[PDB]
Write a protein that binds this DNA or RNA. Structure first.
Ligand SMILES: Nc1ncnc2c1ncn2[C@@H]1O[C@H](COP(=O)(O)OP(=O)(O)OP(=O)(O)O)[C@@H](O)[C@H]1O
Lengths: 349, 349
RNA sequence: CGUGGUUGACACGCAGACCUCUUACAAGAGUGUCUAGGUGCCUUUGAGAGUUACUCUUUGCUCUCUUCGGAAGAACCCUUAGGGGUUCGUGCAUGGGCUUGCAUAGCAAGUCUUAGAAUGCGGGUACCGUACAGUGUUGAAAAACACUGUAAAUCUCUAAAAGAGACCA
């Protein structure tokens, strides 16, 4: 139980009601967490490897993750030209990438639920819930939940943007999710679900485990951008392209706060291999292995670890992580055909 | 063709695109119609007799009508206790009321459709339609459909009060109805549906046939309300209290407009019976039968027709119209049981 | 970017972009490679309903009739082509002399030249060429061939806005 607490809490940087999470992990054998993605565009390393690590941690803790693939949201935002078949193909491509990189799908503790199929199977238990949340929460509160999208004082809203937050908030209760690990973008929807749970008088509020938003590889990009193929490593990139991107990534010397490379290491490399091996010249301390972020940050602040040796090591580790994906997509004919089909689809926005 | 057009146009008071109405009644042999109707407890003379006259005219014009029982909307607005099963029983009771007062169910021209059943049957066609209408119509426009529930523009709405206009706007296309008849308040929703139909380039835009709203009996109130028994008469009322209502109803002599009694005459007894018999005193010209509203109002203006003679004749005509309802209630065991259940249930706004 | 070159490549000096390094963008060094577009044609008919809402004015937005037809042209179909039809594809401001405010002349008011499409802007269409991506053939690489899209993919993707008074301010 305590080990489950540590593993689950390690998933997200912010855990609302840690005492409630403790109670949930003590009483419920398998918590049913919830995280989702819109099957569109490319897939940044943050999304891919962070969700893989989070899901592996949750399954090791014994969590029945219910991934929500938002194909109606992609269609309504007009992704891949608003084609359901193209969006399904992109979703299958992403899921195959994840299966290659390490999602424990074979363990049976991870379920990949499509929004369209699940909704059209049981909407009589879903759309009443969306109407209930829309009725119980007022227009000002719902509009405040949609400011993060960029629609609010900045942009005129299309009622669809009063149905989107309501549907995303009702997804948690439709999936009976006891935990939420959505990104910081939808923490507003998580809080909305919490207050709805207060309204409907439920003693088991959904825990929030918002994943830390990876800053972009370029300086100043606090928000992870998957639409600009210059400030984010994508798991479909080649080895040389990944090396170039990491070499061009921002990395201030002797600065740990706001360091894209250090944060990349902390939440991607260390959680995977339980270590960060760096090979350096004899004048630069030689070969040394860092087993923890504590000694990593201590040495980096002291200046013993320098970017000239740091970035090659990070690039090699990222290539080692991405190699299963590239090998799987080169070897499996179905995966290769999926990659070719996705490359054949031009982005329509 | 022209006879059908005249019969159809005799129903509504404001029919937008009368040219389109004629074109539809020429091209199609059986256009599809609906009426908007929320089942909530007692249902007054405007929703009974005016609605059944309109439906009878439309089915005589060889056009089908789909009765749209808005039980889902009632539940999500909480109206009538917010209980699905007994709201359905109320809807069945009112359907029986319309059957008793007169409705051609033998020919299958009328369709008693419950919103919940139809949505549960065809969610995958209806809810994508709702979201598409939401995408096409902006938040301010959806706000502007506000007075259908009886509120001012400056007030604050709930997100369900934005969900609902889109659900109404999508009910038309979900029913695939060609001519639209509802209250005068839902004109904005009907205009929204028309705009959505020219944003999706569907030919044959739905034709709006707006009804006329009967005002309150007491002068100063122009609205209708089943929760307020001081403004309208019901068909679940007894003869004596109906007479009391008619005599307490405001009716100034030699006044053309603003007379609830005259409007009730024109919209209820003249269309139903093609005539009206008034039992006048022997000093006014004896008993006289009026064949048209024009001559009736002319004789009322000329001063030989007084409220003291109009009210007894109005009461007698209304009672004669309502006799089938009471006879059906006393004869049909199922109808009597439904009425007893309705009386046992409590009505809350 | 221009010089010689019909231009693109090719040498020249430089502008920018691409690649290697102290990887921190910056800053600097390195040696190199690369940039494109051009041609011809056309493009402002008036009306009405809906849309801000509490209305009037100036207009926009879809909008269905209507048209010196949404034209320059594409896709498709009919076929003996000379041709016809459907879908699609439609622009925004101003003149110059006539009279006045002004000595005939900035700009405005009464008509005209629909618009000299005249002045500029932007649009889309067809051809060529360039490069990218894919298809099949000759193919050892390379390249060539014929075909299909892109080049500016990019925001009311969502339509009401302003002024004037109601009408509580
Ligand atoms: N760095 C991250 N770590 C973990 N989860 C993340 C991260 N960034 C986003 N997510 C998750 O991804 C989902 C939102 O995805 P995001 O907004 O990045 O784009 P998308 O909708 O998937 O892509 P597209 O822009 O192509 O539509 C949420 O479920 C959020 O929790």
């Amino acid at each position: 139980p305590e080990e489950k607490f540590k593993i689950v809490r390690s998933v997200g940087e912010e855990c609302i009601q840690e005492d409630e999470l403790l109670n949930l992990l003590t009483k419920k054998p398998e918590p049913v967490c919830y995280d989702g993605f819109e099957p569109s565009g490319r897939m940044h390393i943050a999304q891919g490897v962070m969700k893989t690590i989070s899901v592996n941690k949750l399954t090791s803790a014994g969590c029945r993750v219910k991934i929500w693939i938002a194909d109606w949201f992609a269609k309504l935002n007009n992704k891949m030209g608003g084609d359901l078949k193209k969006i399904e193909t992109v979703g299958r491509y992403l899921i195959e990438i994840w299966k290659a990189v390490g999602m424990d799908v074979e363990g049976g503790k991870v379920e990949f639920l499509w929004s369209s199929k699940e909704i059209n199977a049981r909407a009589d238990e879903y759309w009443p819930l969306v109407l209930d949340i829309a009725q119980k929460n007022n227009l000002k509160r719902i509009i405040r939940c949609s400011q993060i999208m960029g629609r609010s004082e900045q942009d005129e809203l299309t009622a669809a943007q009063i149905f989107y937050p309501c549907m995303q908030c009702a997804d948690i209760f439709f999936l009976k999710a006891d935990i939420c690990q959505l990104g910081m973008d939808q923490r507003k929807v998580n809080v909305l679900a919490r207050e709805y749970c207060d309204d409907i008088k439920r003693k088991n509020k959904p825990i929030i485990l918002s994943h830390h938003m990876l800053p972009g590889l370029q300086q100043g990009q606090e928000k992870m951008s998957k639409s600009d193929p210059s400030s984010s490593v994508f798991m479909e990139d080649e080895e040389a392209e990944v090396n170039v991107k990491i070499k061009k990534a921002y990395c201030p010397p002797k600065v740990v706060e706001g360091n894209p490379c250090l944060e990349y290491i902390k939440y991607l490399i260390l959680p995977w291999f339980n270590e960060f091996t760096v090979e350096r010249s004899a004048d630069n301390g030689g070969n040394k292995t860092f087993k923890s972020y504590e000694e990593l940050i201590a040495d980096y602040e002291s200046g013993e670890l320098h970017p000239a040796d740091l970035k090659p090591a990070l690039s090699k580790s990222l290539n080692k992580i991405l190699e299963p994906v590239r090998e799987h997509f080169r070897k499996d004919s179905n995966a290769k055909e999926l990659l070719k089909r996705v490359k054949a689809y031009r982005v329509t926005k």
